[PDB]
Design a protein around this ligand. Structure first.
Ligand SMILES: NC(=O)c1cccc2nc(-c3ccc([C@@H]4CCCCN4)cc3F)[nH]c12
Length: 348
């Protein structure tokens, strides 16, 4: 391939088939009953629906048995291997949240698989360059000794704390990204002040879907438990908050994290969970107020884009149920993915 090494390694990383199966098994999924090639979008939608019905049964206080049929229905759809004692009973918000979390991931793994299988699996062109196209994203390496790299690295350093210091962060590679399409889609939302460069972390297995389809908002069938401010796109201004969603471990200490410019507009500020969806007039985003915040004085700029790389400090309010700030947008078009980082997590 004509691609740089780092990009070639990035490509292999996100289209890793073993990583997909590892994610499943991790979930207790029986690969013999539900192999990769058997994953279906329709089946996941149906699974989402069952999950929502459970939430309702849980909130109403269904006279059980019904909760048992719901549970049986979900495990019949998504075949898990437990061995004995029987599968857990989805009888609480905590249960559905976990199962829903798994469905989102399976969905992206399915997207990655079908993408990696579609097209001409021919050896005319090298597999790397072929899979690189399926992403429909332009990826370039950002040099270590560039102002870009310097800014980004500082953002990572400053926004990384200690009370969340189970690990340290090492930036291995920085990529500038431009999804084919997302550029004319965001142009209009540019006429929206308050534009910020925020973090978005996710599992490595979700990256083919993300770069290929962009950041998405959960579908209607999906239960809403687990979304403090409703179904939207979540971001942080402190890499510590985002890095928790990369789900890395001493086993696989490397993760991927995005930096996106989001046209926030006027922010509706809240300190506790609230299922918005319909923003108040004049507001174009939600901001969840946390106890920690990057030093406002250290904020920097770039073509109207605010980069809050100031070191973490205590914010005004502490009467919040949030340790960190979060920003939520309800329109995919308010997002412009700009950078992708390959990070190594060094646990203590
Ligand atoms: N990803 C980031 O960088 C990120 C950054 C800041 C806040 C964030 N909040 C989330 C989030 C993730 C998953 C879900 C729900 C949980 C229930 C099952 C369906 N997914 C809900 C969320 F609100 N991500 C955040």
């Amino acid at each position: 391939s004509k691609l740089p090494k780092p990009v070639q390694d990035l490509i292999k990383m996100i289209f890793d088939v073993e990583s997909m199966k590892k994610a499943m098994v991790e979930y207790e999924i029986d690969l013999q009953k539900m192999p990769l090639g058997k994953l279906s979008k329709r089946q996941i939608q149906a699974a989402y629906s069952i999950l929502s019905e459970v939430q309702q049964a849980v909130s109403q206080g269904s006279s059980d048995s019904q909760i048992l049929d719901l549970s049986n229905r979900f495990y019949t759809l998504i075949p898990h291997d437990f061995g004995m004692k029987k599968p857990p009973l989805l009888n609480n918000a905590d249960s559905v949240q976990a199962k829903a979390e798994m469905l989102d991931n399976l969905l992206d793994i399915e997207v990655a698989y079908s993408l990696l299988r579609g097209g001409s699996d021919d050896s005319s062109k090298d597999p790397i360059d072929v899979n690189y196209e399926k992403l429909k994203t332009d990826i370039k390496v950002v040099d270590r000794d560039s102002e870009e790299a310097e800014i980004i690295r500082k953002y990572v350093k400053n926004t990384h704390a200690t009370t969340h210091n189970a690990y340290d962060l090492e930036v291995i590679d920085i990529f500038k990204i431009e999804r084919e399409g997302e550029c004319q889609r965001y142009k209009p939302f540019k006429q929206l002040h308050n534009r910020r460069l925020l973090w978005h972390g996710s599992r490595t297995t979700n990256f083919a879907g993300i770069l290929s389809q962009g950041l998405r908002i959960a579908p209607p069938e999906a239960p809403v438990t687990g979304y403090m401010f409703g179904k939207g796109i979540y971001f942080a201004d402190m890499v510590s908050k985002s890095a928790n969603y990369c789900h890395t471990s001493q086993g696989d200490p490397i993760g991927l994290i995005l930096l996106g410019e989001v046209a926030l507009g006027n922010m509706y500020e809240l300190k506790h969970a609230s299922h918005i969806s319909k923003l108040p007039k004049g507001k174009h985003s939600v901001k969840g107020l946390g106890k920690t915040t990057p030093d406002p004085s250290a904020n920097i700029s770039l073509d109207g884009v605010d980069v809050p790389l100031g070191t973490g400090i205590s914010s005004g309010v502490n009467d919040t149920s949030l340790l960190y700030n979060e920003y939520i947008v309800y329109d995919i078009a308010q997002v412009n993915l700009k950078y992708l980082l390959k990070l190594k997590f060094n646990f203590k």
